[PDB]
């Protein structure tokens, strides 16, 4: 055993001894219970990066432990390939997208392996194979003839100048984020998953998920954003009907969250697509330029409720069914045609935002709820405005003094007798739009005939290949430019027609790749009955919490889809959920030509602890505030780099131990360098031991007769132990368990271990130790162990804890005051001689 750590010299042959022994490399065998951990797959985009060696670090520390603890472990890891990286990469380097990612791939792979991930790479996936897309392909034809899958014509933002579909958070003021010029709103055919129908069993089923974070599944309710609510119809004023067509000419229906407010509904307001908004804006052109500017523009969904609320009168009333009170109608820019009515009524007593409306147009305020005897104030919003559990109605007439539940109640019978309303369910979840105008994605398997319409691709007939001989140069998606393609004939008819251009949403790949895990080479089926039916669902799923929303629900929908096709057994894909942070750092400038900064990334500066420079020169750098690792400002670390410097052992110690998993990670030179010294510590601490009379039987059994020295130690280790399986386990905080390692390897440091039994103890420790650390960083403990012990690592198992060793002893003494029944004086004086051990007497 050399005396020095050298993480390149172990870390190659540790690898090699995995391999060959094919510990990752699982089957569907009956014997071992299985463990599914998964973490998110990476985008072959070209290199590694800390957030993904922070995810796969975490992910890979979970299934070592499980491993360890006798699980069939399965750890698959694939690549997510289809996207746009690649595309703008083509037209930046003429390049073709499938063979820069296919370099990437093998590229990116490389560092996985050389990291040491405990993976199962005979599950290795690509997206962009047609090995895999052909069974998303297969799965859209069979949900497009049950109609799960359809065409309809939606709103695209169009660039004219790059020549392509944008999305909202795309479009700046009105113009596209590269060319700068106005976007034109077009109406397209393209197809959609109608995810509305199991919006119910989506948000309901979030129950289940017991091991989820509140958070995310609170993001996901509020996403699909089920309320129930109540349809309530105005009748329009007979001096409002001009222009007016049909039910629009008699009523003006909307939909309502709060019905036991209808008594103090102050105006309505309508959308700008309204009919009511078209008539009024007839002979109005400021109500027309409103109208314009609602249809022009493009706010992300992210940023629909920071937007300024702004709206106009009409001219027009609505009469309220209930009280009678005639009300205006405005257009206004938060109501959105599509979603209900596209109409909604304001009660600024009781809403913030319609508060906030009415304050900016000094419109009326009608309180009709209170709480308790707080004060009313019209010109200042509280909170308890808003209160549906503890309020009671007033100034509503015969419905004062009702809670909201009775009220809601109370409203609908009124409402249903007069004809004019009743209760409605709606949800603020919209249909999934997958259609894509791009090159580098899955072909929708839909071949349109003029004399069939819009066909599926049969099922022998699939996949439908994207061309790999493609270079896009930005003028247009080239599958619509390349006749060799779209050109063909009807599967019905066998006459003249074209097929579909527009390629498949990527997070379609993300929404199943699970799954396809379970049997990679099936070439019957999205996934085998076999596999399914053996490895079920994923016990422990990884990844960043920016995929909470929509690609979780996305692989949730995708799930129950699959299930009602017979293919899947289980309701949820991820049982265990684990979301990370992000991976921070500082961020260093010149100051530029024109009065502007130009960012330098870290690996190419070096300080002083004060100022900094870059290394190349002497020329000082300013450094600047830290945030997240970006190219946006120059800021990303390689790992690469880290992984040269100090081996992958220190890079995964650093990753766990720098903070726990959801807290963000600041990197810092200083935290490496420790994590490296502790490498070199513990290599240290098993080659003095070794160096001072070899490896002995680690002491077991009875400890009776130890010295307290020696029992305190067995007392520390059990406890680390059980603290930091806990830690695995249960609290999922990593670098607590570190710690916890870290106090076992001082408390020994500190305790003479010389003698026979000493060397028993020193043995018992070091071999616990390293197998706790073992799921961390495996190459320096998998070599230390071999030096401690002959048996494999992974047959010796996870450490158990001894109870006994966290027994305390301490002797049963009697008291006697007077004849008759310094730590022993003590405790009998919190009930004067003392005979050692067995007596003690209190002369009273
Ligand atoms: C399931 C599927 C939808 C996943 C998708 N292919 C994906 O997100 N693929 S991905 O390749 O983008 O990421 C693969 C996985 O590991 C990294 C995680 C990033 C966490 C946030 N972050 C980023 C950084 C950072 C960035 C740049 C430079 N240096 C550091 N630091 N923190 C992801 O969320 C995911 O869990
Ligand atoms: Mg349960
Ligand atoms: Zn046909």
């Known amino acids: 055993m050399q005396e020095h750590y050298q993480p390149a010299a ?34 072959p985009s070209g290199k590694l990066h800390m957030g993904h060696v922070r995810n796969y670090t975490i992910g890979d520390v979970l299934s070592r432990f499980k491993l360890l603890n006798g699980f069939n472990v399965m750890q698959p890891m694939g690549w997510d390939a ?40 005979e599950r290795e996936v690509a997206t962009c194979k047609p090995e895999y897309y052909r069974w998303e392909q297969w799965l859209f034809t069979k949900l497009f003839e049950k109609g799960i899958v359809y065409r309809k014509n939606g709103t695209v933002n169009w660039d004219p100048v790059d020549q392509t579909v944008l999305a909202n958070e795309q479009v700046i003021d009105g113009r596209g984020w590269r060319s700068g010029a106005l976007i034109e709103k077009r109406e397209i055919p393209m197809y959609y998953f109608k995810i509305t129908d199991y919006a119910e069993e989506l948000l309901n089923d979030l129950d289940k998920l017991e091991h989820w974070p509140e958070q995310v599944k609170t993001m996901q309710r509020n996403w699909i954003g089920k309320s129930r609510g109540m349809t309530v119809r105005f009748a329009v004023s007979d001096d409002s009907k001009q222009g ?43 109500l027309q330029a409103f109208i314009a500017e609602c249809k022009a523009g493009s706010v992300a969904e992210a940023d629909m409720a920071t937007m300024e609320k702004k709206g106009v009168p009409t001219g027009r009333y609505v009469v309220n069914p209930l009280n009678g009170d005639k009300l205006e109608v405005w257009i206004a820019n938060y109501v959105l045609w599509g979603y209900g009515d596209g109409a909604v009524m304001a009660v600024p007593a009781h809403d913030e935002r319609d508060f906030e409306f009415a304050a900016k147009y000094n419109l009326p305020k009608k309180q009709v709820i209170a709480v308790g005897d707080n004060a009313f104030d019209a010109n200042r919003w509280q909170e308890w405005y808003g209160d549906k559990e503890n309020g009671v109605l007033v100034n509503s007439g015969d419905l004062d003094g009702l809670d909201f539940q009775t009220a809601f109640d109370a409203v609908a019978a009124k409402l249903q007798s007069q004809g004019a309303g009743e209760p409605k369910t ?31 691709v049969p099922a022998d007939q699939l996949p439908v290949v994207l061309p790999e001989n493609v270079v896009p140069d930005g003028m247009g998606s080239p599958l619509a430019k390349m006749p060799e393609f779209y050109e063909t004939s009807c599967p019905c008819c066998g006459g003249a027609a074209k097929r579909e251009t527009d390629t498949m949403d990527t997070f379609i790949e993300s929404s199943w790749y699970f799954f396809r895990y379970m049997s990679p080479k099936f070439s019957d089926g999205m996934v085998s009955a076999e596999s399914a039916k053996y490895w079920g669902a994923v016990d422990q799923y ?82 600047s505030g830290t945030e997240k690792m970006s190219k946006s400002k120059n800021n990303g670390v390689d790992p690469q780099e880290l992984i040269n410097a100090y081996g992958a052992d220190t890079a995964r110690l650093f990753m766990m131990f720098a903070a726990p998993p959801e807290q963000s990670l600041e990197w810092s030179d200083s935290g490496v360098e420790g994590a490296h010294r502790f490498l070199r510590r513990l290599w240290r601490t098993v080659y003095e031991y070794l160096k ?10 009875n400890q009776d007769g130890l010295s307290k020295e020696l029992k305190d130690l067995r007392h520390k280790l059990h406890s680390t132990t059980a603290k930091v399986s806990d830690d695995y386990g249960r609290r999922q905080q990593f670098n607590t368990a570190i710690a916890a390692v870290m106090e076992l390897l001082n408390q020994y440091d500190k305790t003479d271990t010389g003698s026979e039994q000493g060397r028993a103890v020193a043995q018992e ?15 320096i403990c998998e070599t230390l162990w071999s030096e401690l012990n002959g048996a494999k690592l992974w047959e010796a198992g996870w450490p158990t804890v001894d109870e006994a060793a966290l027994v305390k002893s301490e002797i049963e003494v009697m008291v006697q005051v007077n004849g008759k029944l310094a730590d022993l004086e003590a405790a009998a004086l919190a009930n004067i001689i003392v005979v050692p051990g067995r007596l003690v007497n209190i002369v009273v």
């Open 10 to 43: 172990i870390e190659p042959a540790a690898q090699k001894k995995w391999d060959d022994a094919r510990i990752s490399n699982v089957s569907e065998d009956a014997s071992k219970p299985k463990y599914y951990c998964l973490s998110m797959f990476p985008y």
């Open 82 to 121: 289809f996207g746009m990286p690649a595309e703008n990469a083509a037209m930046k380097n003429n390049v073709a997208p499938a063979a820069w990612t296919y370099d990437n791939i093998e590229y990116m792979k490389t560092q996985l392996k050389s990291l040491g991930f405990a993976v199962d790479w």
């Open 244 to 286: 007016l067509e049909g039910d629009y000419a008699k009523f003006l229906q909307v939909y309502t969250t709060r019905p036991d407010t209808l008594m103090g509904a102050t105006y309505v307001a309508v959308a700008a697509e309204h009919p009511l908004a078209t008539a009024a804006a007839a002979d109005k052109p400021e």
């Open 426 to 456: 709606q949800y603020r979840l919209r249909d999934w739009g997958i259609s894509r105008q791009r090159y580098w994605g899955c072909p929708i398997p839909i071949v349109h005939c003029e004399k069939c319409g819009n066909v599926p």
């Open 542 to 623: 990884i990844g960043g919490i920016e995929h909470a929303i929509l690609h979780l629900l996305y692989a949730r929908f995708f799930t129950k889809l699959m299930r009602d096709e017979g293919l899947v057994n289980v309701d949820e894909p991820f049982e265990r959920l684990l979301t990370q942070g992000m991976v921070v750092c500082e961020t260093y400038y010149r100051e530029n030509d024109k009065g502007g900064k130009d960012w330098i990334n870290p690996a190419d500066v070096e300080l002083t602890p004060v100022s900094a420079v870059l290394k190349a020169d002497g020329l000082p750098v300013v450094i």
């Open 692 to 701: 001072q009379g070899g490896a002995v039987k680690a002491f077991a059994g």
């Open 765 to 779: 420790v070091l071999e616990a130790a390293v197998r706790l650390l073992w799921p961390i960083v495996p190459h």
